[PDB]
Design a protein around this ligand. Sequence first.
Ligand code: NAG
Ligand code: NAG
Ligand code: NAG
Ligand code: NAG
Ligand code: NAG
Ligand code: NAG
Lengths: 50, 246, 198, 237
Amino acid sequence: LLQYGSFCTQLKRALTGIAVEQDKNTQEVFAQVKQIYKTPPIKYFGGFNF
Amino acid sequence: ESNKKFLPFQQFGRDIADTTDAVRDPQTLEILDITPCSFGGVSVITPGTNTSNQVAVLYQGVNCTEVGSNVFQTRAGCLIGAEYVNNSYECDIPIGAGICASYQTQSQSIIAYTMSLGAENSVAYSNNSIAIPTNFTISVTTEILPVSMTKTSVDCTMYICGDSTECSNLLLQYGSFCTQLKRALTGIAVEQDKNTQEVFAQVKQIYKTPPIKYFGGFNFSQILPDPSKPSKRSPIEDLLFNKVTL
Amino acid sequence: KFNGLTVLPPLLTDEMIAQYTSALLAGTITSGWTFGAGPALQIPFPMQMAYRFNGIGVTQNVLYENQKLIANQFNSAIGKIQDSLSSTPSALGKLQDVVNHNAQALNTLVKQLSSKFGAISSVLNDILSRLDPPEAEVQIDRLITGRLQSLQTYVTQQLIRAAEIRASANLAATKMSECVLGQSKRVDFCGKGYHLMS
Amino acid sequence: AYRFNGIGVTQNVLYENQKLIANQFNSAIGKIQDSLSSTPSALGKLQDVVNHNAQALNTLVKQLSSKFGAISSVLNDILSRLDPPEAEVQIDRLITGRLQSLQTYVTQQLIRAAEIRASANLAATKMSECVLGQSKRVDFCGKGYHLMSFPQSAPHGVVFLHVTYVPAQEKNFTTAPAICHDGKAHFPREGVFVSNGTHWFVTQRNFYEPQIITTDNTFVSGNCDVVIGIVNNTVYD
Ligand SMILES: *[C@@H]1O[C@H](CO)[C@@H](O)[C@H](O)[C@H]1NC(C)=O
Ligand SMILES: *[C@@H]1O[C@H](CO)[C@@H](O)[C@H](O)[C@H]1NC(C)=O
Ligand SMILES: *[C@@H]1O[C@H](CO)[C@@H](O)[C@H](O)[C@H]1NC(C)=O
Ligand SMILES: *[C@@H]1O[C@H](CO)[C@@H](O)[C@H](O)[C@H]1NC(C)=O
Ligand SMILES: *[C@@H]1O[C@H](CO)[C@@H](O)[C@H](O)[C@H]1NC(C)=O
Ligand SMILES: *[C@@H]1O[C@H](CO)[C@@H](O)[C@H](O)[C@H]1NC(C)=O
C-alpha cells in the first residue's frame, strides 16, 4: 500500500476538518451571550407561567 | 468465558458485522468469547516551540491501566504529562468533553482543567423598578469575508502522457473524461469571476469626494484613498494588502 | 469497536448547552431585548409585553385592560405544547435522520470488508499462511483497490452531508440572533402571525 | 441625526453632543489599524484559501512520481528500454492512477467552490443591506444598534467596518404603567413614566431626559379602575 501514494493523508485531513467544523457549528449557534444570567427566586411575572 | 447457548452442532459464532466472536475448544467442549486487543490513536498537546518544549500525550479512548507520574482519566481517554486543578478558565486547547489544557506559570507547566462558560450575573427583577441609561458610546467593529479563489486550468495529455504518442493513443481508448474535467474547471472559473462582479459592482456611477475634507468634525483620512502613493489605496487597505502574503 | 473506526466526543457536554439555554431564557425574561445590545436593563414583564404590543401596531391600553385573558391564553398554549410533541410520531424526524444516516454509512463501510473483489479469499491472514510471497501480491492488489475505493466513497459522502449540516446550523444561528434576542418584522420568519417573542 | 432618529433617539441628543460623538468616532477609527496589526490570526480566513490552493496543487504535482505497480514512473525510459508489445501493461497502471488523481482533485475543487459561492452571496447581501442603508436586524451589521458601515477591499475578500451605538451609565428608577387623574387613566405617547422619589416625569427610550407630564405627551383612552398598579398624580395642562 505504501507504493500507491498519499491518499490517506488527504482522507485524514478531510475528516479532521469535518470534525472541527462540527464543533464550530455548536459553538456559533449556542455561545451567543458572555454572561450567565440567573432567574430570581420568586417566580411571579404578572400572571405568566414559565 | 462465554455465556452463549451453543447448540450441539454449531462450531463458530458471528455478529451483525459478520465477524468471529465465539469458538469452542476441540479438546474440551467449552464456548469461549474472542475480543480484539486494545488499540487507539495518540495525540500530542504542546504550546508553541517559542514558548517551551514540554508536551503532553493523549491516548484516545483507552483506559489508563493498559498503557510522567501524573496520569489522568478523561472521557476522551488517558492523559499523561498534565496536572488537573479545580480552577476554571477560558478554554485554550480543546481536548474532550469539556476539558481544556493550558501552559500556566502556576513554575511553568502544562495543566488541564474544565472550561468556564462565563461570568455569573443576576439582574434584579422586581414589580416596579426600571433601569435607564444616561450616556452612550460609539463603537467600530470589523468583519472579514472571502469572495473568490484562484482559477486554474489543466491539460489532460500533458499531465498524463506528456509527449508520448503511444500513451496518447492508449488513453484515447478510455473515453471522454477530460471533456468533463475541462467543463467543470471552466465553470468554476466563470463562477469565480461572477462572484466578484456581483459583490463589488453595485453602483453604476463613479462618485468623487469634494476637495475640502470637512464633514462637521468627522475624520475620514484612514479610509479615503491616499493620492500620494501610486496605487491609490487607503492606509488600512495598505495594511491589509501587506499582511496577506503567500 | 470496528476496525480502525473511532467516534470522538463533542467538546461541549449537554449540561453546558442546557446552562447556555437557561442563561438566554433568564436574560430574555428579566431584561427584554436590552441584554442583546449592551448591558442588561431591568423592566417589569407586563411593561415589556405592552412594548411588544406597541411594536406590532397595537396600543398599550389594549394589553393593560386584558392582562388576565392574555396570561390565560399564553398558559394554555404553553401547556398544549408537550401533548402536541408527544402525540405526533414523526415530530422529530429531522434529528433522527442524522443518526440513521450515520449508522447506515458506518454499517455499509464495515460490511464492505467481506467482499473478495476477485480473489481466492477476503482474509489476508489465510492467504499469508497458505500461499508463498511471490504470488500473494496478485490477490492482495484487488483487495487494496476495492477497500481504497470504498474509503473514498465514504469520505465524499461525509463531505457532501457536512455542507448541508453547516448550512442548517447557519440558519439556526441567524434565527436565534433575530427571533430570540429581538423582535422581527420579517413575514413568516419567527412563526405564523405577528411575532412577539421566542 | 437622521440615523439617530432611526435608531430611536431624538435629534437634539446628537445636536447637543456633536463634538463628543466626533471625538469618539475618531478614536474608534484610529484604534482599528492597531487592532488589525496586533492580532496575528486576524486574517486567517483569507490565508486559508491560498494555503488550500497551494496544498492541492502541490499534492497533484507530487502524485506524478508514484509507480502504481510498474517498473518505473517515467514513460521516456520505458519507451527507450522495452519493446512496443509489452509497454502497454506498464502504461495502463500509470494511466489509471493519474486519472484517479485528476478526478479527486476536480471533485475537491467543486466542493470548495460551492462554499466560496455561498460566502460571496452572504457578502453581497451584507454590502447591500448594511452599507447602502440602515438595518434593523439584530447582530447583522455588528453588535449594538447599527448606524452605518464602510467597505474595504482585501486580497480575495472584503472587510466591513460597522459603527454602532451602545448605551452606558444606567440608573435605577421607579415606574408605573399609567397615571390616574380626575378618574381618568393616562398612558405615555412615547416613553415611560419615571420617578426620582418624589416627582413623576415622562422620559424617552434609551436616554434619560425627564419632562413634565402634560396632555400633549399622553392620551386618556380609558378609566382608572381597570389597570393594575396604576399610580395617581396631577397632570398639567
Ligand atoms: C479501567 O479499568 C478499571 C479496572 O477496575 C475499571 O474499574 C474502570 O471502569 C476502567 N475505565 C473505564 C473508563 O472503563
Ligand atoms: C476539586 O475540589 C474537590 C473538593 O472536594 C476535591 O476533592 C478535588 O480533588 C479537586 N480537584 C483537583 C484538586 O484536581
Ligand atoms: C408584584 O405584584 C403582585 C400583584 O400582582 C404581588 O402579588 C407580588 O407580591 C408583587 N411582588 C413582590 C415581590 O412583592
Ligand atoms: C439598580 O438596582 C439594583 C437593585 O437595587 C442594583 O443592584 C443596581 O446596581 C442598580 N443600578 C445601578 C446602575 O446602580
Ligand atoms: C425629583 O424632582 C423634583 C422636581 O424638580 C425635585 O425637586 C426633587 O429634588 C427630585 N428628587 C431628588 C431626590 O432630587
Ligand atoms: C390616589 O391614590 C391613593 C393611593 O393609592 C388612594 O388612596 C386614593 O384613593 C387615590 N385617589 C382617588 C381619588 O381614588
